[PDB]
Specification:
Layout lengths: L13 E6 L2 E10 L2 E12 L2 E5 L5 H14 L4 E5 L5 H4 L2 H6 L3 E4 L1 H10 L6 E2 L8 E5 L2 E5 L10 E4 L4 E5 L21 H11 L5 E4 L8 H14 L2
Parallel strand pairs: 4-5, 5-6, 6-7, 11-12
Antiparallel strand pairs: 1-2, 2-3, 3-4, 8-9, 9-10, 10-11
Helix pairs in contact: 5-6
The structure holds L-captopril, magnesium ion and zinc ion (2 copies).
Subcellular location: Periplasm
Pfam families: Lactamase_B
InterPro entries: BlaB//VIM/IMP-1, Metallo-B-lactamas, NDM-1-like, RibonucZ/Hydroxyglut_hydro, VIM-1/2/7, VIM-1/2_MBL
């Protein structure tokens, strides 16, 4: 059921309903001779929508907004970027031009600025220390500690038991640790443990790339990170 990278041409975006009021959005890009998918989240926030992450680039994010308009028809009023990479903030300017209030932690904003990436407008306080959690409407934002990046946030939708791990959590078919250029390999397993400890009731786990699964994705991620660490 879940759209794979072979089913979405670069430039198009698919929506996938995970639970009532919760969708992932799936987009693709070519990189270094392969095509990769990328997921974000959409969470119904009363009569508005909360967007988690861009669709990885301006063109995809424009397509995302058009697809949300077509398929859901509620306004995207806020967006949270869960780390500073282009699959999370690339397209912030498109969101901003569309009247979406864009948010990220100060750690993400600082790192995005260093990288020369797009910078969400608003700063999310209360997430600077590993284990910090803040409510953001229909989701909880959780900073589990450094993992895939030092700023990576995870997002939990308590009404749907959906845990969005972002790029700190790998899909089952991923055997490498992904892009580790900005990762904290030493802390990544401990950060995963914090996610497991805070959301042991999670029923759906959404990685930043690839197929959703369950909490098994967390142990899988730990195994993959350990294997990469021991290369
Ligand atoms: C843009 C994302 C951010 S997690 C990324 O690093 N990717 C996605 C494609 C592969 C890998 C890379 O560029 O090395
Ligand atoms: Mg595994
Ligand atoms: Zn990343
Ligand atoms: Zn990513």
């Amino acid at each position: 059921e879940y759209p794979t990278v072979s089913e979405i041409p670069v430039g198009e975006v698919r929506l996938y309903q995970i639970a009532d009021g919760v969708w992932s959005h799936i987009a693709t890009q070519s990189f270094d001779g392969a095509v990769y998918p990328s997921n974000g989240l959409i969470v119904r926030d009363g009569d508005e929508l909360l967007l988690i992450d861009t669709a990885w680039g301006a063109k995809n994010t424009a397509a995302l907004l058009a697809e949300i308009e077509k398929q859901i028809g509620l306004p995207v009023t806020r967006a949270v970027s869960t780390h500073f990479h282009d699959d999370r903030v690339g397209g912030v300017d498109v969101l901003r031009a569309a009247g979406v209030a864009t948010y990220a932690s100060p750690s993400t904003r600082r790192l995005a600025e260093v990288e020369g990436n797009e910078i969400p407008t608003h700063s999310l306080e209360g997430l600077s220390s590993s284990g910090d959690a803040v409510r953001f409407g229909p989701v909880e934002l959780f900073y589990p500690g450094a993992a895939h990046s030092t700023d990576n946030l995870v997002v939990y939708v308590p009404s749907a038991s959906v845990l969005y791990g972002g790029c700190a959590i790998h899909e089952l078919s991923r055997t490498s640790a992904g892009n580790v250029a900005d990762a904290d390999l030493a802390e990544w397993p401990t950060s995963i443990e914090r996610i497991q400890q805070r959301y042991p009731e999670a029923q759906f786990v959404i990685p930043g790339h690839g197929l959703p699964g369950g909490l098994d994705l967390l142990k899988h991620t730990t195994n993959v990170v350990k294997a990469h660490t021991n290369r």
